[PDB]
Design a protein around this ligand. Sequence first.
Ligand code: GDP
Ligand code: MG
Lengths: 77, 136, 386, 277
Amino acid sequence: AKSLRASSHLNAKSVKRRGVFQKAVDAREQRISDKLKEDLLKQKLEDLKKWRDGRHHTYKKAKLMKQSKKKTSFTRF
Amino acid sequence: SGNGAQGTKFRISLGLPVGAIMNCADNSGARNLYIIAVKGSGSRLNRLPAASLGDMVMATVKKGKPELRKKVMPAIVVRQAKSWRRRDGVFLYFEDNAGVIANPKGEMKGSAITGPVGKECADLWPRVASNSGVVV
Amino acid sequence: SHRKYEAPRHGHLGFLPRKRAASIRARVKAFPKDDRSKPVALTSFLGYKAGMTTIVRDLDRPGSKFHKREVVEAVTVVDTPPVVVVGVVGYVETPRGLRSLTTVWAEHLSDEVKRRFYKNWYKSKKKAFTKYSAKYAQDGAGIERELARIKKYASVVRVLVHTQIRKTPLAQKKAHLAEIQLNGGSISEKVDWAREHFEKTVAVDSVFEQNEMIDAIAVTKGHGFEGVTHRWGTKKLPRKTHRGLRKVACIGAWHPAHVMWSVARAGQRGYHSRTSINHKIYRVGKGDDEANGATSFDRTKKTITPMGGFVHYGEIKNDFIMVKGCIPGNRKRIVTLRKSLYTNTSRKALEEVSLKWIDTASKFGKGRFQTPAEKHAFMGTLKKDL
Amino acid sequence: SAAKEAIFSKGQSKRIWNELYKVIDSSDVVIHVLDARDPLGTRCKSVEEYMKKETPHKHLIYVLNKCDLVPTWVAAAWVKHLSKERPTLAFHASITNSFGKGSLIQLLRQFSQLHTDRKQISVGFIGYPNTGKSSIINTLRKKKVCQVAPIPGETKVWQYITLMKRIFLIDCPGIVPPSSKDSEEDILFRGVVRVEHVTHPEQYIPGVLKRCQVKHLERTYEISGWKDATEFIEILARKQGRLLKGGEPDESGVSKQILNDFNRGKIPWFVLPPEKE
RNA sequence: UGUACAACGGGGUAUUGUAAGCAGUAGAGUAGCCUUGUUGUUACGAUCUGCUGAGAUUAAGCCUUUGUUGUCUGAUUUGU
RNA sequence: GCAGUCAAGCGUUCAUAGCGACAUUGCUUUUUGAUUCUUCGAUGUCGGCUCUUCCUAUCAUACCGAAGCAGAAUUCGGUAAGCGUUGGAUUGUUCACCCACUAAUAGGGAGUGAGCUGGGUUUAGACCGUCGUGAGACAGGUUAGUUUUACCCUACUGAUGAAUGUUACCGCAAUAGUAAUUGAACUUAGUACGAGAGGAACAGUUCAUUCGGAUAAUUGGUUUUUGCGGCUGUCUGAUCAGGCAUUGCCGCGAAGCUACCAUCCGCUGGAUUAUGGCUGAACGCCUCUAAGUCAGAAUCCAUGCUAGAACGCGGUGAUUUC
RNA sequence: CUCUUAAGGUAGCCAAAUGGAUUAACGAGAUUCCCACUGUCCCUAUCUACUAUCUAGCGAAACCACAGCCAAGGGGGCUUGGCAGAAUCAGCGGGGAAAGAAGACCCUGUUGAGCUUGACUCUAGU
RNA sequence: GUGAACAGCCUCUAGUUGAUAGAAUAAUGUAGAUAAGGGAAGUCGGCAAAAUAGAUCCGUAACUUCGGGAUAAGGAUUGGC
RNA sequence: AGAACUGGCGAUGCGGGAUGAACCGAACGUAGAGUUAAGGUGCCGGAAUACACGCUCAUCAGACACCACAAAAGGUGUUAGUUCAUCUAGACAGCCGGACGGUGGCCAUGGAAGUCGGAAUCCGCUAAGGAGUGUGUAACAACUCACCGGCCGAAUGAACUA
RNA sequence: AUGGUGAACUAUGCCUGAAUAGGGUGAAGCCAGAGGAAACUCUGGUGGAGGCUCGUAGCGGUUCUGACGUGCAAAUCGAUCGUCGAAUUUGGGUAUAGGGGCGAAAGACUAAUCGAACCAUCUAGUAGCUGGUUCCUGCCGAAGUUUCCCUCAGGAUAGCAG
Ligand SMILES: Nc1nc2c(ncn2[C@@H]2O[C@H](COP(=O)(O)OP(=O)(O)O)[C@@H](O)[C@H]2O)c(=O)[nH]1
Ligand SMILES: [Mg+2]
C-alpha cells in the first residue's frame, strides 16, 4: 500500500528518528570518538618510546598564458 | 496469510507446483490430493503457482472415497519432499509430500493426522497442531 | 497491437551502462551529512573482503517469530588492518560544484603508498615525495600556508588514508589510497585533527563499532562477456530454435526503426560498481585478541580464521569487520565501508547482536571440525604418529 | 463441486447451430433422426417447436435409426407412439443390409410429388451427433458418401447429397439442446460425448448398470457377481488384464471402454417404450 | 640483491575409501596324503581378516613455509 | 429511426409562409424478477513465443469528494500512468466464456509478413460431395507437402584508443539513466460503531508477494580435479601397473560456476494535483482567489544510486647528465 | 373412382453356426486418450569436444547511383530543429535501392499449346 | 576374444597416421550429457529426450478369417567362486 | 453527380507562402544601376524592438485559411454597445423593525396550525404582509422571503448584441 | 516445321552372370502314448512351410523446430526409420526413340534437359509490349479535341504548327 515516498509513513519515520534512533546514533558516535582518542593516545605513547610557491606560480602563469595564446579561456577572452 | 492461519509465514522452498499429487495425511478417506491452485501466490507470468509446507492449496481428491472425489476442497500441506531450511540452520526434507483436508477457515475435516507434521505448518495452523500426533 | 500479457521489465534501467567499473576500488559518491556539533570522525574506512562464514545468533527481535530463538546467519568477514592518514584535501563550494582547493601530505610516506604512484616501482628511483618532504624542513612554512588556506576557504575537508596492505595475506604490495571525508567539528578542528594524525594509524574500531549498520561500496565480481539469458534473466527460447535459444527473440517494432536502449543485449556482466547499504556489523574483531571466533556461548578459544585459512585468502591476523549477509565484490577485493547516510529508523538498526557461535570449519571442503585440535581428537592417532 | 467439463457443452456451439439453421432454411422436408434406444432422450423438441412456429410449411418426419438394436416390439411400440405426433419411420442404416430404405425412398418421392411446382426438393437430416444421419444418407445413396464415425462430432459442416434429380439430401452436424431438464449425466449416455475427455468416467458406470440389465451385462463381458459398479470395473479389469503398473486396475480406462461399448451398441440396452394404450 | 621472486620439498586443509606386498587356515567345498583324525593334514579356492582412515591426490584461481635449487635481463619511447 | 407534440429562439416585412434548440409521446415479447434457460449466412484468415516502449479513456494500489456512508463493505465521481495487471481448460486461432488464484486479473498504440513458429494465400499427389455431356470447376470436406543475412552501413549492447609538455595518483560533476512494489500479521481490539449480527483505522511492530542488485557461509545441482574408488569387454604372459572403448560406464567428489532450489540488501527532503482551508476584494451581503497564503496524491524535482563529457574541470606527486 | 401408414412389457420371428461392413491381421497412413517416463516446462544451471576469438600461412562471394544519426514538415539530398570529434574490436539482427523471390494471389493483349466436346474445316481407319 | 551374430568394442597379419597449424577457453552456436522438488502445468502437437530393451522362468485379454492377436499385458531373476 | 463556358498545369524557370502539382506575385538572352510586385522588417533573416488608437492573460493563448467543422451552446473573464425598467415621493447593498386579523379556512389521519398531501385560493386591516418562499416541529413554536417601513445617500437593475 | 542424334542416367521386356549374418514363430507329413467300434479326438515329439516375423550386409528414403544452405555435394552428412529370401537387389549383353518410347499411371522417367528430349537449319520466325536509340547552337513551336466506322481494339477525317 503506502509507498516509499509516502508522506504519511515518512512523517512517522521522522517523528521516530528524533527519539531512540538519533539517541543511539549520537551515543554510538560518542563511544567511537572516545575509542579514536584512546587510539591516538596509545600511538603518541608508543611514539615517546623512541601565490603558493614558485612552482605553482610559474605553473599558473604558463597555463593562463597558454589559454590566452590559444584562445581557450572559459573566463577571459 | 490465509484464513485461519496464525500469524506470518516465512519463506520456505516451494515444493509443490500445480499438478502435483500429494498424499492425504488425515483420515478423511482421501488417499491423495491433486493441487489445482495455491492460495496467496503472486502473478508472475509463466510461473506455476507452487506450494510448500504450511501453505493452503486447492486440491481435488483423485483416488479414494467416492463421497469425496469430484470435489475441490482446500488442503494444507503438512509434509514435503523438497529440502527446505530451518532457521536454526538445517536443511531438511520428509520422505513424501502430503497434506490434510481443511475447510477454508482452517478446521480439519479428519479427526487425526498420521505421520509427521512439519513444525512450520503445525505452528501456523492451530487445528493442524491440534490434530497431529507427530510434529517434526 | 498492445502487449497481450503485461510483464515487468527484465533488469534495472538505473544500473546502466552495465560497463566495467573504471577502477577496482569503487568510489564513494556520497558521504553522511556533516553535523558540526559532533566531534571529528571518519565517515568511511577501507578493508579487504576475506570471505564468508556461518553465524548462530541469539536473536532478540521482539514482535518477531524468531524472537528468543537462535537463528543461523551467513556473514561476510572483511579484513581491516588500521589505515594510516597521509594527507588532507580541502574542498570549496563553487557554483559549478565542489572543487579540490589544495592537498597537504605527511612528511614521511611509506613504501606502500609510494608504490601506488608507480607502474614500475622496481625500476624506479623511488623519487615519489622527495621535493615535498623539504617543505617540512623550512619550519613547515608552505605546509602551514596550505593548512591555513584550508581553514580559511574549505567547506568540506577530506582526509587521505591508505591501507597497510602488507599486513594482509594479499600478494599485492601497492597500497590502496582514498579520500575519507571528516564529519563533525568545525573546519579548523578537522584540519587540526588531520594534521595531528599525518602518520598515525586509525583502527577500524575508531570508525565503526558492533551493532552498527554500514554501507558496503565495492566493484562486484567480474564475469566477462555474458549473454542476455543471464545478464538480464530473459527466458530461454524454446528448444532448438533456429539461430539459438539463449537470446532475446524480437528486438523492435516497425518503429522507432532502431533498437532501443531498453532492449536487453549481451555484453559485459559483473565488475560493476555497486553501493549496498544497511549491513549490520556482527563483530568488530581485534587482531591481537586470540579467540576472535569464540563467544560467551562457545568457549573453544579460536580465531575467526577457518581451518586451512580462507580459500583464496590467507589468515585473519588483523582487526576485522564481520557484517551480516553478503557484500558486493569477491574475496581479496578492496571494499569501502561507509557510515550510514541516514539515521535508520528500522528496529534492526537498534538491535544488539548476540553471537552464539562462528563457523571456523574449513571452507575448502565439507569441513566438519572447528580446530585442528578437535580434528585430531576426533580422528585419533594416525600412522604418522606411532 | 468441480467445474462443468467443456465436453458436456459440445454440440451447443454456435457454429453448429448456425449450420443447422442453414440446413432448415434450405430444406423442404426435415428428417429428425431418433435413436431407437432411447428416442425421447434423443428428441430435440426445441427445434421442432421452432419449426412449428417459424416454418410451418417445412415437413418434420421422424426416422427411428439404430432400430436394429432394440427388440422388434420396442421399435413397433415407438413408431406407434411417435406416429401420434409426427409421421415416423423405423429404420436400420447399413449400406449392405438396411431396413426401411425402400419406405424412406417412397416417402421422399411422395414429398417431391407434392411439390411438383418446386423442381428441386432438399431433405435435411437433424438429430443428436451420434444418431446416424450420415449413415442414413449413405444407406439411401448406397455407398460411403457422408463421413461416418462412431466418435461423435465428426462432420462439422453440412453437405448436399443428390439422391435423385428432384431430391437433395443435406447432412448436418448433430446438435444438443441446452435445456437444463436433461442432466449432464444424460448428455453422456446418449452418445453425444467423446468419452476420452471425461475426467472421472468411473462415476457414470452405476449409470450404465442402471440402463443395462445384469443378465446381458454378465454376457457382454464374461464376468459375474459384482456387488456394485465400483467393483464391476475392477473385476472386469482384472479379467481383461487392464492393470496398471503395480497390480492396480486401470479403473478409469476400463470405465471409458465400458461407456464406449454402451453408446456404440455393443451392450444390449434400451429404455422401454410408454405403456399400452 | 631482498622479511624479493620462482621451481621443488616439508606442514596443514580438503577428496576418496583402506594401496602394493606378505601373512593367517578365516573360508562354500572338491581333489590328494597318511597320524583315519574333530584347529587330521597337503594343495587349490570367490572372498574375509592383520599390517592399513591405509594408499593416492591436494592449486592448476586453497592456506602456510627457519628447507633445497636457481633468477634478477632485455627492448622501446617521452621535455613546458 | 420514423411519425407527432411543445416552443426558447429564428425568419422577420404576415410570427402561420415557414424553420426551429431543449423537453416530451407513440411504436419494440405477457406489468408480480417466470421466461425472454435461446443460438439464425462476419467470404475474415491472423496468432503465439520472446521482448521493449508509449497512451489514459484508471482495474489495482495513493490521496480526495458525494451518498442512509452507524461500523464493515459498497456505489458514483475527482487528481493520478509512479507501479503492477496471473495459472490453466476450450475450439481454424483470438476474444468470449469456463475454472481458479489475485491487490487487480483495465482498455488500447507502435509492434514483432521471410527474429522463431501454427494454421491459412499452400503450387504439380490423392480421396469423397455438388455441378458440368466432357476436359474439368467448385457450396464443400479430408489429407501430405524444401525456403537459405549481416561477412556491408546504421542502430543498439559491451571493449580499445591518437593528441592537446610527459607521467602518476586523488577527486569534482555537466549531462544522461534511475526503482522499488503489493499483501497480512501482532498491537491499537473484539475498542470506536452497533438492538444484534458483526466490526475499522492512525501511532508502535513482524513477515511475506512481485521486482531489482549482489553474493556462494550453508544446502542443492554440476565434474576432464579424469581427484579417488569400482565395473564390463579386450589388449600388455600372470601379479603390478596400465592402454582402448568419439569424456567407456558406475559411486563419491573438492575448487569453480551456480539456484527465490541458496542467502543478503533496496531512503528522505522540498514543490505540487484533486481537494480542504486562511485572510480578502470584485459586488456596503457573501465568497478558498482576483492580490496574497496554509495543508495536501504512489505525482514532480531533488537526496540517494549507475555512467562520467573519450574535444568538461580541479588538486597533487615526479619530471631524464655526460 | 376408390384408399394407404398404431405389432408389446429386456431379445422376436427365424432363412439351406451366422444373420455381419461395428470385418481379424498388417501400416514410417490421419486422430483421441491412458500408464510409465522425463529440463517440454516451473526456471534455469553446469560440464565436454569443435567453432567463434587471437596469431602465421592461404584467401573468396553475394551485393554495390552516391552516401549512411535522429524528430516534425515536404498534398537520406529540400525546410525547421535535436545535434555532431580521429581511428576502431566483439556481439547483434531494429532499420537500410541493402541484398536476399518480387516471388505468390490479381489486371490487360487478340498469346502460344495441353486436353475435351454434334464448335468449324479435314482426315487415318472402317 | 566377448557375444546368438559377418552387430557394437578390443586385438594379431597387413596398412595408415593423410584432413593448414599454434595460443587461449567470452557470449552465441554445432554435437553430447547431468540436474533437486513437481511431472506435460510447456506446445498448434509429449516434438525432442527420458523410460523400455538381451536371456531364463511364470503368466498373458478383447477380438478373430481360428492362422493369429502375442515379445500382448503383468511379474521373478541374472555377477563371482 | 451531369451539363456549358472560361482560366491554371502538360512544355515553365524566377520572387513569396519555413516546406510543396493546384496559393499570391511575375513579358526567362548576358550584365550594370535604380525602382518595385507578392511577402515582409525582434533574432534566425535584407528591412522600424517605428509612430498611433483600442482590445487580450489562456494550469500548454495566438500568430490561420472562416455565408469551414468540432460550433449550438456553457463562464461570478474583460471591454464596448442596444432595448426596457427603477430612482432625493430616496435607487442598488446592507443592518434594524413590521411581516397582522377571520384562521388552527375545507378534506384527510395517530399528527398535519402557510410549508407530507387533494382541491379552494377569498375577505378584512393596511405602509405592507402568500389561505404562504424555504429552514424547522410528532404537531405547534422560532427563523426566513415576497412585501412594506426606519437609517444611509446617488446612481442601479434586467434581457440581449458585438 | 524439315532433317538428324541419344536407353552410359532412368522406365520396361528379354539373354547370361552374381549377392543376401544370426534369431522368433513353428504349417503339412511322420513317430510314440492314451481314448473310441470307427470316422477321428487329446498328449508328447519330429519336421522345418511362409510373397511370415526381429534384425545385419543390401535395397529404400520416413521423421527431425537436425548439420549444410557460394555446401564436401546443382540433393551430401547425422541420427531415426521401411524392408531384408523375395512382385528381391544387381553387372554385362540386348530391344523399344520424340506428336514417339516406356510407365504397379506420379505426366512418372527417357544423359542435372520433359505439360512433350537433344542437335542443326528454314530463322535475323512473328511485338499488342518493355528497354535503349550517340554532336552544338539559333529560330519557330504545338496537341492533349471535334466527326465517323454498333462498340473495345484498330483505325480514316477535321482542329492546332508549319
Ligand atoms: N447398430 C447400428 N448402428 C448404427 C446404425 N446407424 C448408425 N450406426 C452407427 O453410428 C456410427 C456413426 O454414427 P454417424 O452415422 O456418424 O452419426 P451421425 O453424425 O448422426 O450421422 C456408425 O459407426 C454406425 O455403426 C444402425 O442402424 N444400427
Ligand atoms: Mg455425420
